[PDB]
């Protein structure tokens, strides 16, 4: 059930139109605007359905994006941080996310995609990148990555829960 998860996610995320880069002040405001509306709609729906897994906010310039994500399994709760910046050229090849919380846990991957799984995401994005933006990126890249890594990293012995670190 991979292709169907992918289809559902795009079937619930509203589609954009503009594909501009931050190079142009005005063009960026337009592109950024559609991206925000699509992402806000997605998180509004997702969080309202008590299905929240990520949180993402950005600077007034929309150049750098940051957020956090939480996952639940075996009655335990975990948290992770994320921070990335958009390339000035914004190419057809998707952007790259970084996770400081896991910087050192996961092995140093090849130079280009330290946590950007490529298995199905790279061919999926390359075959279809009409108007795909950050909402689509996270839900079809960050989402599956976390859903693949949580079970594996737990059984392998890399991650643990943090309740016990406090109360």
């Amino acid at each position: 059930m991979a292709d169907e998860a992918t289809r559902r996610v795009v079937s619930e995320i509203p589609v954009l139109k503009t594909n501009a880069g931050p190079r142009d002040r005005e063009l960026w405001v337009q592109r950024l605007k559609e991206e925000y509306q699509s992402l806000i709609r997605y998180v509004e729906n997702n969080k309202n359905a008590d299905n929240d897994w990520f949180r993402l906010e950005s600077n007034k310039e929309g150049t750098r994006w940051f957020g956090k994500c939480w996952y639940i399994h075996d009655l335990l709760k975990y948290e992770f941080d994320i921070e990335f910046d958009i390339p000035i050229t914004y190419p057809t090849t998707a952007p790259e996310i970084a996770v400081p919380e896991l910087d050192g846990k996961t092995a140093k991957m090849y130079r280009g995609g330290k946590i950007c799984l490529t298995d199905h995401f790279k061919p999926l994005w390359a075959r279809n990148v009409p108007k795909f933006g950050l909402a689509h990126l996270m839900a079809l890249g960050l989402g599956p990555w976390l859903a693949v890594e949580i079970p594996d990293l737990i059984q392998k012995g890399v991650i643990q829960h943090k309740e016990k670190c406090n109360q």
Binding site: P14, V15, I40
Partner: peptide
């Protein structure tokens, strides 16, 4: 080529500052 059946962004003349403001504020 119209795409009436496909989903479309909630673009109702909102402003960027407002968009990002509700976004960061939503947590």
């Amino acid at each position: 080529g119209m795409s009436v059946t496909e989903l479309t962004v909630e673009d109702s003349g909102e402003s960027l500052e407002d968009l990002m403001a509700k976004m960061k504020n939503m947590w």
